[PDB]
């Protein structure tokens, strides 16, 4: 009943390199240099993608053409840590990165997975959001969380009171390299009512409560 745990999310600039570590939590893991370790990534909106693997005992590595020479998988017997290093990072590397292994020293069915390490590549810098209202004109309204970095942000409505009819959409990468996001709510046309969304970007310690008036 092995369980894998991965290191935390990392924000990198183009041209840099990153190293992600996979470990086993508890005493469920056995010898790390014993099993074959596989790394796969998942670009946004795309399907799973095999990057490469490492044989358990002899540690012979195999990579996919699209990453040849760009990636190094490794495993530390002494610390019981599996690593993946990807250099020359490109904005096309922004994706979820998974660690996996099977039961034997040779590659096979991936029985165990980590919860994923998100690696975001943006030449941007930590930047709090600007919140603009989406004024009403049943009715709809919301808040626009524009040009922030990096994810995520939390949107409430009337400090958590209003929670019905609400849709907070997933963020979107614009050319500018910053995150833009929308949060809406549908309300009775006959309302009188006063609405405010509460945006919070943790990195930048930004707390924003903008009202929406027609």
């Amino acid at each position: 009943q092995v369980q894998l745990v991965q290191s935390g999310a990392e924000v990198k600039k183009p041209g840099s390199s990153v190293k992600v570590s996979c470990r086993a939590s508890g005493g469920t893991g056995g010898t790390f240099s014993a099993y074959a370790f596989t790394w796969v990534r998942q670009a946004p909106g795309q399907g799973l993608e095999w990057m490469g693997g490492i044989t358990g005992m002899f540690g012979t590595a195999n990579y996919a053409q699209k990453f040849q020479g760009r990636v190094t998988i490794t495993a530390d017997e002494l610390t019981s840590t599996a690593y993946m290093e990807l250099s020359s990072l490109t904005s096309e590397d922004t994706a979820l990165y998974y660690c996996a292994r099977g039961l034997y020293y040779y590659e096979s069915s991936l029985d165990y997975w980590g919860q994923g390490t998100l690696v975001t590549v943006s030449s941007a810098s930590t930047k709090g959001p600007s919140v603009f209202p989406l004024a009403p004109s049943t009715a709809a309204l919301g808040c626009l969380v524009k040009d922030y970095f990096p994810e995520p942000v939390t949107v409430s409505w009337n400090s958590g009171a209003l929670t019905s009819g609400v849709h907070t959409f997933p963020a979107v990468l614009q050319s500018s390299g910053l995150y833009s996001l929308s949060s809406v709510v549908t309300v009775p046309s006959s309302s009188t009512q006063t609405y405010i969304c509460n945006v919070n970007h943790k990195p930048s310690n930004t707390k924003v409560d903008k009202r929406v008036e027609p």
Binding site: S109, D111, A140
Partner: protein, 214 residues
């Protein structure tokens, strides 16, 4: 290299139905060396089938796998609410150990035409040199929807980005938000801003619009 292709792209079924997923191999593949995975939202991938037909430990009996040669299938006898997720097939016979593009199992329901709303830019964002008009498609099904930005009956492109929510847990619906982003200089050289929406639930395409000085 062995290429896997999965079918269908999206599988729309109801709770309780049987689901049949397909994985096609570019060349003959011994039964062994084909595994299936489950990607529940926000979670790590999970092994269901290895060796093409062998259930993995702790896997409910309603998952099964068969197939030989190029054609392999995953069967979910009776769909449970927690079975609506993304399934991927993986080959580990040779290298590279390729994946399929994934097949999305979604909850099927009655056609629901969207409610279309359009929001003009905030007069505050206009104090900055930028303007963002937001089109929102609310509570529709199926997910297929085309949103066309028409600035004075001119089809835009490259200047809009859109996001789609998950299939809602309660009403099994989708919602979509599109953002057309211009500069105040250009924004102020046009009069009509329209969101043209086409959805199988609509007799005809719907167009929501406003004029700049409204």
């Amino acid at each position: 290299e062995i290429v896997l292709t999965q079918s269908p792209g999206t599988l729309s079924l109801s709770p309780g139905e049987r689901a049949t997923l397909s994985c096609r191999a570019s060349q003959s593949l011994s039964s062994k060396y084909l595994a299936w995975y489950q990607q529940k939202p926000g979670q790590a991938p999970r092994l269901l089938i290895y060796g093409a037909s062998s259930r993995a430990t702790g896997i409910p009996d309603r998952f099964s796998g068969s197939g030989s040669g190029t054609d392999f299938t995953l069967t979910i006898s009776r769909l449970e609410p927690e079975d609506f997720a993304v399934y991927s097939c993986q080959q580990y016979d040779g290298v590279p150990r390729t994946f399929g593009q994934g097949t999305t199992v979604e909850i099927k329901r009655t056609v629901a035409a969207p409610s279309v709303f359009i929001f003009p830019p905030s007069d505050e964002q206009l104090k900055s040199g930028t303007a963002s008009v937001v089109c929102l498609l609310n509570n529709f099904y199926p997910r297929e929807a085309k949103v066309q930005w028409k600035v004075d009956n001119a089809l835009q492109s490259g200047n809009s980005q859109e996001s789609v929510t998950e299939q809602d847990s309660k009403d099994s619906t989708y919602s979509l938000s599109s953002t057309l982003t211009l500069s105040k200089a250009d924004y102020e050289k046009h009069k009509v801003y329209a969101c043209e929406v086409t959805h199988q639930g609509l007799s005809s395409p719907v167009t929501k619009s406003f004029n700049r000085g409204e």
